[PDB]
Amino acid sequence: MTANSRSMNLSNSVAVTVYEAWRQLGYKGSWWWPRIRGP
Amino acid sequence: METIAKHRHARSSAQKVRLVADLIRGKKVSQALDILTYTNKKAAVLVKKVLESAIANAEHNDGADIDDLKVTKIFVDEGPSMKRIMPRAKGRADRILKRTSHITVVVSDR
Amino acid sequence: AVQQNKPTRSKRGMRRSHDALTAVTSLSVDKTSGEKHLRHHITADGYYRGRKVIAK
Amino acid sequence: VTGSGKKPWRQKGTGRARSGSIKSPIWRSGGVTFAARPQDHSQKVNKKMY
Amino acid sequence: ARVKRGVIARARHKKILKQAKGYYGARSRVYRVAFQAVIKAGQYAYRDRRQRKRQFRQLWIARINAAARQNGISYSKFINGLKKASVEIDRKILADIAVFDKVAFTALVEKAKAALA
RNA sequence: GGUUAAGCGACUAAGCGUACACGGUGGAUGCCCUGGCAGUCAGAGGCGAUGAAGGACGUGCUAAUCUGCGAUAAGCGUCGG
RNA sequence: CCCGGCGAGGGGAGUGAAAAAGAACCUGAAACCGUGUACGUACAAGCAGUGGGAGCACGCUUAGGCGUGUGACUGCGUACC
RNA sequence: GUAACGGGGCUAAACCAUGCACCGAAGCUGCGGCAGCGACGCUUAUGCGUUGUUGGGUAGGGGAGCGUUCUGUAAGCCUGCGAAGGUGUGCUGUGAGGCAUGCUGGAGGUAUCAGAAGUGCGAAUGCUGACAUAAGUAACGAUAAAGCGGGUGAAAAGCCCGCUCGCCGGAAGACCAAGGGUUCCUGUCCAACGUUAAUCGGGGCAGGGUGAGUCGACCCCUAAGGCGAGGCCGAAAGGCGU
Lengths: 39, 110, 56, 50, 117
Description:
The structure is cut from a larger assembly and holds chains A (about 40 residues), B (about 110 residues), C (about 55 residues), D (about 50 residues) and E (about 120 residues). Chain A is mostly helical and about 40 residues long. Chain A contains 1 helix and no strands. Chain A is rod-shaped, with a radius of gyration of 20 Å. In chain A, about 0% of the residues are buried. Chain B has one domain (about 1-110): CATH 3.90.470.10. Chain B is elongated, with a radius of gyration of 17 Å. The termini of chain B are close together. With about 110 residues, chain B is α+β, with helices and mostly antiparallel strands. Chain D is low in regular secondary structure. The radius of gyration of chain D is 22 Å and the shape is rod-shaped. The N and C termini of chain D lie far apart (about 45 Å). The interface of A and B includes residues 10, 14, 18 and 28 of A. It is classed as ribosome. Keywords: Ribosomal nascent chain, ribosomal arrest peptide, ribosomal translation, ribosome stalling, 70S Ribosome, ribosome. The entry is titled "Structure of E.coli ribosome in complex with an engineered arrest peptide and trigger factor". Chain A: eRAP-NC.
């Protein structure tokens, strides 16, 4: 009773996992190099 | 008359299998069995199994004389795709597609 | 570097025009057993150029 | 609509469009823009013209 | 009193795509591009309905001029001579006569040449 | 008939385009409803130290998830249908 | 019953009004991906269309030519909000 | 990079003066059709005939319409002689549109005149699902290293035996407390999971396994600290303390 059931089952969990993987705080910008056209 | 054999939901991408299917389009059955034997591809096993199964059908269900059958039609098309997740650097995550295929072979005495 | 416009299916088809693989046609028959094999290779039942070999 | 007032994500920085509510009328499972209340459709007719 | 938009929108989309048969690439498969292609085609057709009336007159002039010099006269003198002789023949008819009947054209040319005198 | 010149020139598709026929993937559209929403007319407007609301662990021929029940544990006594 | 690894997936037989209703199971669109047929394409420069226009294939037809598909060559032409 | 006639080229195809022809626009004329605004006649309303004139258009004002879901007309009418839906073809209105019919579909649909709107989508770095491109490209997670024979198996570089080789050895060895909760052992299976294959596994399924007077909790005693009968304070909630 395994094959189709669990095989398709994992495709539901991947959606929520990718959904959570987007906490987005780790965005770490400030583009550390000097500003493009600074003062 | 025609005889069909199919392998649905085969674990391989459609593009890779289509390379093998081009060799045996329009050949005689004996030659096709010879060619697939001496080709080093994963897909060659699946196609050879399907072709042998198609040969068996044309003899037991339909008539006989396997000595003059030919490969009239053969084509490949996509099936459902399983989706999995694979982690990357800095907390990012990516989608992964595991593709399948449908294999059909048409053999006839014409 | 990334594309600026997605290439067409035509261009995808043109690039793949060299991906076709080739058959063998170099099938040879052994003198004694008469079975098929590649050139310069041992047959399945261990025969090479008629004379029996290891045949494990 | 049953939900919470937290912002979905910050204002700037990310590449997405600006959003401020999970229950916006333009989102799936959001609210209706001009919802309806129970009404009363009766009219008036003068005695003489009845 | 809720109204769904499926059938009507599908019909309206199918109406446009049926007008874009034969166009290249995505200009016959996706609505957003086929719409603009159809509008352009309409504009071009409207504009060309005017230009069609100029190219044919240009061609008729060229053929008449070529045929007239075979009989030793220029186009402008030929046309002017026809007017002094009171001849009303359409340029389309003149080109047709020039192609399909040499003798009649020669008669016309001689008449015009006499009319100039 | 032949031999020389000079001039002109059908037939190829590694692949690609458009049209038509037949398919695959995907799940819209139509048609359904013991699920909801808003109300009229009546009822009741509390439960608990005689241990509440809410729970834990148990309970079957078979072991569990729902539904009941409490070591008298998918049930015990009596009066009616 | 047959091929296959005492597989997965198929082809028969059988039930049913229907299996192209076969359990991922009413109907089943679009993007997207294929096989087959007809025409075009390897000296040619640009919003890819529009106005002219040979040739080829198929159907009707009594001539005479019509209808469908493709489209060599040529005039004009720098998307939408 | 010719490039200070658009080019080719030009001693007229250059520049003055005169003249007659012709080309040249959606301008004007010819033929056919539609719609306004007036005038004039018949019906003297509508219905008409004979005329004159008008019709590029953003912001914006005014006038007419098409189509979708629901209520009445409805126990009416159409429906296996095949409804809604899907997919082609052919006709006709100035337009939104309408009608007939082939194939799928297998049970509902609505003249006509009125009424009420969740009434029409291409854009909003719009929201949800599905599917493309880059591309069969980059990568397969420590440079401690592997070679051969036999076995099982449909299939063996990766599994099991054997020999040889290499690495760690104040650890990459043997234990305990935290934390986890059957991952432990045996037998079976390979469709998903294992960054490849797999007969293998911390994967699926079924059985089994944890024995205490002395080891540890529980128990007896208190530190920092907590609670706190009375008590003292405080709009209420409460705060501090014997």
